Design a protein around this ligand. Structure first.
Ligand SMILES: N[C@@H](Cc1c[nH]c2ccccc12)C(=O)O
Ligand SMILES: [Mg+2]
Ligand SMILES: [Mg+2]
Ligand SMILES: [Mg+2]
Ligand SMILES: [Mg+2]
Ligand SMILES: [Mg+2]
Ligand SMILES: [Mg+2]
Ligand SMILES: [Mg+2]
Ligand SMILES: [Mg+2]
Ligand SMILES: [Mg+2]
Ligand SMILES: [Mg+2]
Ligand SMILES: [Mg+2]
Ligand SMILES: [Mg+2]
Ligand SMILES: [Mg+2]
Ligand SMILES: [Mg+2]
Ligand SMILES: [Mg+2]
Ligand SMILES: [Mg+2]
Ligand SMILES: [Mg+2]
Ligand SMILES: [Mg+2]
Ligand SMILES: [Mg+2]
Ligand SMILES: [Mg+2]
Ligand SMILES: [Mg+2]
Ligand SMILES: [Mg+2]
Ligand SMILES: [Mg+2]
Ligand SMILES: [Mg+2]
Ligand SMILES: [Mg+2]
Ligand SMILES: [Mg+2]
Ligand SMILES: [Mg+2]
Ligand SMILES: [Mg+2]
Ligand SMILES: [Mg+2]
Ligand SMILES: [Mg+2]
Ligand SMILES: [Mg+2]
Ligand SMILES: [Mg+2]
Ligand SMILES: [Mg+2]
Ligand SMILES: [Mg+2]
Ligand SMILES: [Mg+2]
Ligand SMILES: [Mg+2]
Ligand SMILES: [Mg+2]
Ligand SMILES: [Mg+2]
Ligand SMILES: [Mg+2]
Ligand SMILES: [Mg+2]
Ligand SMILES: [Mg+2]
Ligand SMILES: [Mg+2]
Ligand SMILES: [Mg+2]
Ligand SMILES: [Mg+2]
Ligand SMILES: [Mg+2]
Lengths: 16, 41, 77, 46
RNA sequence: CUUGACACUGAACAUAUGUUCUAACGUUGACCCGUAAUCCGGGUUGCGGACAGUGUCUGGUGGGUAGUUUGACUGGGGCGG
RNA sequence: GGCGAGGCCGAAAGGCGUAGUCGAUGGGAAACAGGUUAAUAUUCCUGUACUUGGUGUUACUGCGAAGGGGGGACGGAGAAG
RNA sequence: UUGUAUAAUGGGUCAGCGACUUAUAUUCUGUAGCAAGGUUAACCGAAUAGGGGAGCCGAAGGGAAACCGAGUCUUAACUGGGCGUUAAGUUGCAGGGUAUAGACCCGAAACCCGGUGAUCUAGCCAUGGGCAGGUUGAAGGUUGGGUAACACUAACUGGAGGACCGAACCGACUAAUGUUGAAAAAUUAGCGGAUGACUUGUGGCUGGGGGUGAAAGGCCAAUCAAACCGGGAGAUAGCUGGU
RNA sequence: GGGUGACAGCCCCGUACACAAAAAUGCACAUGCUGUGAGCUCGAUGAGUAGGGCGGGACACGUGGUAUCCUGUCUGAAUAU
RNA sequence: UAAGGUGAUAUGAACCGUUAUAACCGGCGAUUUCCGAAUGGGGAAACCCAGUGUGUUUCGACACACUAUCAUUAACUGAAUCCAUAGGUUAAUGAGGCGAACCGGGGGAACUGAAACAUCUAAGUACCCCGAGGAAAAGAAAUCAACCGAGAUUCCCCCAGU
């Protein structure tokens, strides 16, 4: 499936 | 509705006589209680 | 079912057409009523689910004739 | 962790068994589809 | 959901209205029968009664629900123009 | 809770439901100790028991239900013998 | 792409597969036949022959039309003017383009239709089980004082509570570890409830614009601002990649 | 057409052709039984129907100047002059 | 029809047959457990439990047959209610379920196209349901035509992308 650090929100939305 | 009275109902006509009555009055009262036969001939 | 016992009228489908012609499905239902007809041949009251057009057919033709027709078509009453 | 399959033969057979398939009208359609495919096993009974 | 017209839906009387009646119709009142049965059907009676309810047509209301619209330019977009 | 003869209802398929008939997680008769096999035993063996039903003799005798009654038949907590 | 060594995209490499096609109609070109003509379709024929000329295109145009016709229309009529006469077509085969079909290939999020799902979870219904141990001491009661009778009070008794401390059991507040883990949500050390609006076993019921929800758009089989499965379906894609 | 130790007209199975059915059955005839009635004369000519009002649908025809067909509701003839 | 044969992986053992009961092929028959429309009741398919009637027993029991529902017809019986009806019992006949497509009918979308979208299209398509057949449906003018005529229905090519 998918990696947890890609599902996470604090590190994915790192540069809004 | 044209109906032939077979009795005397004093309200509308005499015995053996053709007269115009309302359809429900012929259907529900007269024909189920005698007193009238439709003009089938 | 909403089927007339005498004339066989059943619901039919059509459309609601508005002022802007928007078509949506709808049903036309017959004017069914359960009426007790006095049959003289049997000295009996027979209850029929019949429309008002069917009631007019009853009054024209005679209850005995349409009871014979119903018995020929096989449905109970 | 409690997972989604907690098996029970009685509930299995009342849900997906042959008599429940024949009881509902669309279950007979399911059996028709599986027979037309040619499955070795139609329902969960065997 | 609601309003009216026509149908199922009838009869007298008084000035469309009002009063009165039973036979359509309703009864999720009582009793009897099918029947070993709080469904259903038939019968008698009682209470309503041409009212209610339903069908076709019809005006109102109707984010309860549905289908969609909500422009472009633009020293990024919106606001302004 | 399910299915459901007739039945009531619904464009068709089907929805509900009476009589019934299924459905335990509950109610309903009766076995214990010792020993044994590589692997079974309240099941086999030894010892001692118990239950229900059919048949046949004996004695007395009003038996019989789909019906009436009793019973089965029921909570929480606590305290002590 | 204005522009890539670009630190912009794609590719670990090999081998096999992978993207302008097909049918019908129409216009243009080349070529072949016949030529003011060309050619048949369905069908008959055992017949790739032959029959079949039903039709279609062309040899005549102008006008909205009647109508006129190498003319016609406009206008009451043109010295006029517009459109025409002043240039050969047609039927195959091959090709370019177009049109309808998926129309060069792969790719959505979504919409609709019919079913399979409450063995996880939400709620409810039926019927069974569980909660070591230790505290606190409400109402009520008995005796005594007290009152005209109550009221009030002391001791003994009693055993209330969505009561208290704490295992089972239920949960999940903090920290570290783990994060290609022992584990697609746990371990360790502490933490909250623990006779109740408690928790649990077996079985049943509620279905997708629907259920259930002490309400977080939460949960409905590791999926939920509308489940999963098959179908309309090769949806559509003025967008990206490849050719 | 296939096979045979490599490519077969003449090695094998086959093919063209000519035959074959005790039993069951299809078809086209002919023929019994059962059921059915033809020929001639006179008479009759499908009524809640056609049509109409309202709402829809089908016709290539989207209510348009809209013919025609079907009908959910309400009515309703002529009938061979 | 035959000198070979007892199906295959798959040998082996024991055999059968060689001029016609070996084996192989075809027609007709026989047997055909249990589930399944499932049909005696029930059921968690391939299982549990019977009622009735014959017949046999070694007295323990055993074998066979029938018993679903609905429709039509007939007989017998029969309520509230006096005749009758409703109902009940039996007998006979028929149906049910499965199947690729085609066919008639009852319901009936949306994505999509319109370069948005709502009338419109997609489309009476997909899909659901009912029924029938070897085909179905339609069919013998209350039809067209045009002052002349044709002569039921169905299907193909034109008319005409008019
Ligand atoms: N990383 C943690 C938490 C986690 C699980 N799944 C996730 C998805 C998204 C973000 C975090 C997580 C773990 O592996 O257990
Ligand atoms: Mg109520
Ligand atoms: Mg909205
Ligand atoms: Mg939008
Ligand atoms: Mg802009
Ligand atoms: Mg700006
Ligand atoms: Mg029950
Ligand atoms: Mg029934
Ligand atoms: Mg039910
Ligand atoms: Mg029982
Ligand atoms: Mg039990
Ligand atoms: Mg052991
Ligand atoms: Mg460039
Ligand atoms: Mg750039
Ligand atoms: Mg450079
Ligand atoms: Mg580099
Ligand atoms: Mg690069
Ligand atoms: Mg890119
Ligand atoms: Mg890369
Ligand atoms: Mg011309
Ligand atoms: Mg949408
Ligand atoms: Mg559950
Ligand atoms: Mg507490
Ligand atoms: Mg929780
Ligand atoms: Mg938390
Ligand atoms: Mg812990
Ligand atoms: Mg506490
Ligand atoms: Mg505690
Ligand atoms: Mg929110
Ligand atoms: Mg989940
Ligand atoms: Mg949605
Ligand atoms: Mg499509
Ligand atoms: Mg696609
Ligand atoms: Mg070789
Ligand atoms: Mg006629
Ligand atoms: Mg009409
Ligand atoms: Mg008209
Ligand atoms: Mg059964
Ligand atoms: Mg059985
Ligand atoms: Mg039983
Ligand atoms: Mg059949
Ligand atoms: Mg849309
Ligand atoms: Mg569009
Ligand atoms: Mg578009
Ligand atoms: Mg026919
Ligand atoms: Mg003529």
């Amino acid at each position: 499936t998918s990696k947890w650090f890609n599902i996470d929100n604090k590190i994915v939305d790192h540069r809004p | 509705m044209q109906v032939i009275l077979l009795d005397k109902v004093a309200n509308l006509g005499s015995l053996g006589d053709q007269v115009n009555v309302k359809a429900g009055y012929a259907r529900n009262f007269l024909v189920p209680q005698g007193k009238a036969v439709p003009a089938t001939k | 079912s909403r089927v007339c016992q005498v004339t066989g009228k059943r619901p039919v489908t059509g459309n609601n057409r508005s002022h802007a012609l928007n078509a949506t499905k709808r049903r036309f239902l017959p004017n069914l009523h359960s009426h007790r007809f006095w049959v003289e041949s049997e000295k009996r009251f027979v209850t029929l689910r019949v429309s008002a057009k069917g009631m007019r057919v009853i009054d024209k033709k005679g209850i005995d004739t349409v009871l014979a027709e119903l018995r020929a078509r096989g449905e109970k009453y | 962790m409690k997972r989604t399959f907690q098996p029970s033969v009685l509930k299995r057979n009342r849900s997906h068994g042959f008599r429940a398939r024949m009881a509902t009208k669309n279950g007979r359609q399911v059996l028709a589809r599986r027979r037309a495919k040619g499955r070795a096993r139609l329902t969960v009974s065997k």
